Amino acid sequence: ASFNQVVTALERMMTSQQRLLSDISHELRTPLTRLQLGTALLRRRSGESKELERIETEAQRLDSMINDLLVMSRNQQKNALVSETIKANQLWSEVLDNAAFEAEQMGKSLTVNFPPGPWPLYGNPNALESALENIVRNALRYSHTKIEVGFAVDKDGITITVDDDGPGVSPEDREQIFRPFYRTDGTGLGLAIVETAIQQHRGWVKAEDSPLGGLRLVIWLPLYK
Amino acid sequence: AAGASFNQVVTALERMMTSQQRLLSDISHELRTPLTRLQLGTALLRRRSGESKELERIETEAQRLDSMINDLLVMSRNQQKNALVSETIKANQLWSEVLDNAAFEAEQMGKSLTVNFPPGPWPLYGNPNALESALENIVRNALRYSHTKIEVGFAVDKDGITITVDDDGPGVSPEDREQIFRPFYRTDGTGLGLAIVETAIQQHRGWVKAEDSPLGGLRLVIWLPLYKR
């Protein structure tokens, strides 16, 4: 009865927040659908215009961001409820191997100087895997020729350091580095989701000067005790 | 053992809400960029081709979306905190301060507030801050829109509490009786807005309705279920 009342109250709060997001999406998509209908009618008729193609593609990009809001929000629930103990080397082995392949295809190099060990972590494996994958792919794009990935552990947590030889980053640019949600280079995700996912696992992220000349991204995650 | 597990639930759900609030704030900020590119494309098209019913329509839809994004940005900046913790509370203790502050506000405005049917010690279960702000918002709206007076009535039965807020204002047209609760509604502050009032009431398994008031203006009805031990 009371355990049941607590479970019902928690779900009721979660569902009402999801209904509000969903209702915000329905309102935004009312003018967007009218706009997409107007565009389609014009495009079907006066069909060869760079401006009309631009309006359609931007309307679709706006629509994808709204879809991201709904998908990524229902998914942040999954990270909260779906958690397990995992070892750092088993968690990120595939990401580091796929990144080494991506580096090779690009004509760049990835060096894992300090490899991960069987260090226990607690959280959502998919979210922690994609957070490192995102920063590593960011280094693969920004780097001139090389990227380096280092793992360190102490009694309290795991430090992941991602370095690149990309252009020197200004302290101002470094301070706002985790602010963009989308990649400026739908749209691919920027580094805001990385900070979000890491803070959700009670860790932190920092942007610093890299010894290789480019950007240094530092992830800290607590050890599972 | 069970406490540690239950507290691990609540704190994980608290971290989830922090990340969902950040996500809403982030995406709200990103929406403007394709919209301005779309508005530039529309402005250019109007120069190249002439006046068009379709182009004029795209333009009025892009402006409506711009207003909604402005409103979504303000909504994303004023998100509520500690929304998870629930407790048993009595209706009179919950809303006493709101009704007293409203009586003072009415006096300052040169208007009158009458609580004809006062709240009793009726048990509710949920978030006090959300339930308090929900009534505060509808009462502060009645104060703002009323011509001279507002009335607040509380009724209880075996299943729930009915709160009726009346004003002698211009009211709300039948066409917008449900529309005023939609995010970003505008006719074209007193609080977080009517969409956030309906969310707070529906999370407590209640409902809100807009009706004709015997006072001539708007009647807002809130229904909330009783907490049953």
Ligand SMILES: Nc1ncnc2c1ncn2[C@@H]1O[C@H](COP(=O)(O)OP(=O)(O)O)[C@@H](O)[C@H]1O
């Ligand atoms: N008591 C009322 N009388 C008349 N109109 C009302 C009343 N309460 C709300 N409304 C209408 O509903 C709209 C949405 O309400 P609300 O979200 O609380 O305020 P806001 O104007 O800040 O968006 C108001 O702008 C107004 O047009």
Ligand SMILES: [Mg+2]
């Ligand atoms: Mg108002």
